[PDB]
Amino acid sequence: AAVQKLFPYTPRAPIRQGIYSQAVVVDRTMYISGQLGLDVASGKLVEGGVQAQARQALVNMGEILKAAGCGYDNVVKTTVLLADMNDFVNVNDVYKTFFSKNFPARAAYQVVALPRGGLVEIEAVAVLG
Amino acid sequence: QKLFPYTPRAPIRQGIYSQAVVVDRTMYISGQLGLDVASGKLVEGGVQAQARQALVNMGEILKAAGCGYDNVVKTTVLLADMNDFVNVNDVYKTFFSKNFPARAAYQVVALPRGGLVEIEAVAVLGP
Amino acid sequence: AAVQKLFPYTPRAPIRQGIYSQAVVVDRTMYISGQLGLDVASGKLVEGGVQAQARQALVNMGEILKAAGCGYDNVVKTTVLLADMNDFVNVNDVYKTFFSKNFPARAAYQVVALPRGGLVEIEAVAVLG
């Protein structure tokens, strides 16, 4: 038969309309698209560099979680894609203000480039309660 | 409750990975390259041709599990060059036209076989 | 409602306290953090290059699997992150010694840099029996 996919959407977080969904929920599992440090009000990356962008990516992720009836506690795995491996600690310090206990599994590493010239992209898997 | 669908119509690295693993209702699909099994080589024509062939390969694996593109819930698009982003998205959109997967996309240094694009995916089977 | 999350822990694999859990198990699915070729006893990457590091990364992953009551046969998907794509065969040659049949799905690619200067990092998803 068909598959019961859900597509929770919020205009408070970015999307590439017609290319990807902010998130897809199937039964208990929520796949969240890679989040960038974009401000939906401006359509541009926030200023201030990797720390500001990482914070805004996680703010964006939180709006998507909330649209599905979830919160940061629901995240079970993230991948932190960095423009510069040197930013590991500074990004971790931002990250821990969102995931402060019961931490997701994680991988973090430096890639060549991200969409929109971003300095960080964060994807996630969450599970519904 | 764990299946390993295989199709000779898509590539594999025998003894290294399965094309896909179906466990419960979730299907994990290996990173697909723009390889043509008939020639044993990457298709000619550049990143658009390779991205299309990768997605054709993914479709053959999906069909081997009784699925189609609608079952895909998440993909990761790995590019050799971020300058190919628009051209790859245009090909990508011809396979996923609504109810789109979640997605991550980024440029890496290099891919197996010298490919210009690799696409991995998670799909979910319907009841 | 809250989602029920379990965090396998082994003293035989690394952990970044306050940043990530070695793995998260939710409703039979286990997300394993990216593993480097780190020797917990020495606090350093092992001697011997990418093949020694890949072996240690997989040994570490196996100890985390054991903490969840799992083994290598429970792994359903891995991602192999390389410092150098020319190491592909060498890493495959170590990787295949840990799986004999019913192999995980896999993705592999060369990144710019990994934490600790590692030459290879392997993340995984597993499913409990």
Author numbering:
A (entry chain B), C (entry chain C): 2 to 130
B (entry chain A): 5 to 131
Kindly provide excerpts from the paper associated with this entry.
The term Rid (reactive intermediate deaminase) refers to the hydrolytic deamination of highly reactive and labile enamines/imines to α-ketoacid and ammonia, a reaction that would be otherwise relatively slow if left to occur spontaneously. In the present study, we identified two functionally active RidA genes in the salmon genome, here named ridA-1 and ridA-2, and we performed an extensive biochemical and structural characterization of their products (SsRidA-1 and SsRidA-2). In order to better understand the structural bases of the observed differences in terms of protein stability and of enzymatic activity, the crystal structures of SsRidA-1 and SsRidA-2 were determined at 1.05 Å and at 1.36 Å resolutions, respectively. Monomeric SsRidA-1 and SsRidA-2 share the chorismate mutase-like fold common to all the members of the YjgF/YER057c/UK114 superfamily: monomers fold in a single compact domain of one six-stranded β-sheet packed against two α-helices.
The two SsRidA-2 trimers are virtually identical (r.m.s.d. values 0.45 Å/380 Cα) and also SsRidA-2 monomers are all well superposable (r.m.s.d. values in the 0.15–0.26 Å range over the whole Cα chain). However, SsRidA-2 is the only ortholog with a Pro residue in position 9 in place of Ile or Val in the other analysed sequences. Residue 9 is part of strand β1 and a substitution of Val or Ile, which are highly compatible with a β-structure, with Pro, a β-breaker, results in a shorter and less regular β1 strand in SsRidA-2 compared to SsRidA-1. In SsRidA-2 this intermolecular two-strand β-sheet is not present and both regions are partially disordered in the structure. Secondly, the shortening of β1strand by Pro9 reduces the H-bond network in the central β sheet likely decreasing the stability of the monomeric fold. Crucially, residues 16–18 are typically small and hydrophobic in RidA primary structures, while Arg and Gln are present in position 17 and 18, respectively, in SsRidA-2. This confers very different chemical properties to SsRidA-2 binding pocket compared to SsRidA-1. On the other hand, SsRidA-2 has a positive charge in position 17 and, under our experimental conditions, showed a strong preference for the IA derived from L-Glu, while the lack of activity on the IA derived from L-Asp cannot be explained. On the other hand, SsRidA-2 showed a more canonical denaturation curve revealing a Tm of 65 °C.
